[PDB]
Each structure stands twice: as C-alpha cells, then as structure tokens.
C-alpha cells in the first residue's frame, strides 16, 4: 500500500464494495515530532483505507478530494472507526471514486463525499 | 511572528502580500529536514498532498485573522496536480469568497506551475 505520507494511519482493517478499519489515537502518535489528530491527517487516514480497497479490487495515486467536513476533533484515547465505500472504477480512464466516514464512539467526526484515485 | 495553528507545524515561511477581506500571497521553502519528511530515507521524499491543503489552510486563516476564533471546518474541490519536492518553493494564494455572519479558495504553485487547487476551504467560529 503506497503512501507519500510517512506513517500508515490504519491500525487494522476489520471487495469492490466497502472497507472498514480502525485506528486508536494515543499519546505516542508518531505523526508529529515533539494535542489532537489534525483534520488533514484524518483525510489521509480514510484515503489509505480506500486504497486498500482499490488494491483489493495496478498503481494508484490520491488525485483529489471533495466534500470533507470535520464535525468533532479526534483526541488521544479515541478510537477512530473508518469506512470507505467504492462508488465507480472505470478502467476506461482508470478513475476510482470512494466515499469515507469517521466515527468516534459511534459519532461522526468527519465526512468525505468523494476521494479520487488514478 | 506566530498565531494559532491546528497542526503542530507552521507550513508558511513568509507572507509576501495581503489586502484584508480579499487576498494574500505567502510562500514556503521545502526543506530536506521537515517533520513530514522524516519517516524514511534517500529515494524520493515528496511533500504529502494533504500537508499542502494544511499549509494553504494555515495561510487562508491568517487572512481570516486579518479581516473570534477560526476553526478549519471542511474542504471542497482539492485537486493535486504536481508533486512538491525539497528545494521547490511552494507559492500559495487564497482569496476570500464569503464571511457568512467563512470561505476562501486557494492555489499553490512551484515555479509558476500549479501543483494544487482547492475550490473551497470552510472555517467556522469558536
């Protein structure tokens, strides 16, 4: 699974339709260097999940993204629950469009209408 | 010269122009020793498209600030055209779109060539 971002943000994943995975945030969190999980890192988190699907459905690059809304911040001790649903995969152009959601104890912390990969 | 930031790192080295409630133009020098790079060695360190909307979001707020707390709420139409590498100078610009009692657009270039587009960044209050 290709990521231009250094650390993988999916602790574990729990075809051609949908994926679910987890990520417990902690005090460790190698994502900075020396406290909350920035919204753009949540965008990165869902986007790595999506590709795990795409890869189980052949190189692919996160091309774009739209429809992102961060409802609540993600804090240390929070278990992020992520789901990405496949929308279309036209090999015609080679474009895939996923949709993503993030939960924190059953609540929505971040929505994503569409994530493009090519 | 610092003001509030969501992310731990300021992704704007210098603002080179600004006209309140309208537009601004900052710039960032991609170092070989940046946090988001430290995480693997010699090969092809490429600045994450995601840390690009942050840099631009940080820049977009400094405009909201110069135009009350601004919380980066959401984002639409982000297209990553070109990869940003170390040594490149990312030239950013964001334009106020609305202040509904906030929204701005942002563009990032490298040597006059567009490397990333954001149709809209949404910032809430408090």
UniProtKB/TrEMBL annotation, chain A:
GO terms for biological process: fatty acid biosynthetic process; lipid A biosynthetic process. The keyword Signal applies. Its EC number is 4.2.1.59. Keywords: Cytoplasm, Lipid A biosynthesis, Lipid biosynthesis, Lipid metabolism, Lyase, Signal. It is found in: Cytoplasm. GO terms for cellular component: cytoplasm; membrane. The keyword NAD does not apply. GO terms for molecular function: (3R)-hydroxyacyl-[acyl-carrier-protein] dehydratase activity. Involved in unsaturated fatty acids biosynthesis. Catalyzes the dehydration of short chain beta-hydroxyacyl-ACPs and long chain saturated and unsaturated beta-hydroxyacyl-ACPs. This is 3-hydroxyacyl-[acyl-carrier-protein] dehydratase. The lineage of its organism: Eukaryota, Sar, Alveolata, Apicomplexa, Aconoidasida. The chain holds residues 96 to 227 of 230 of the full protein.
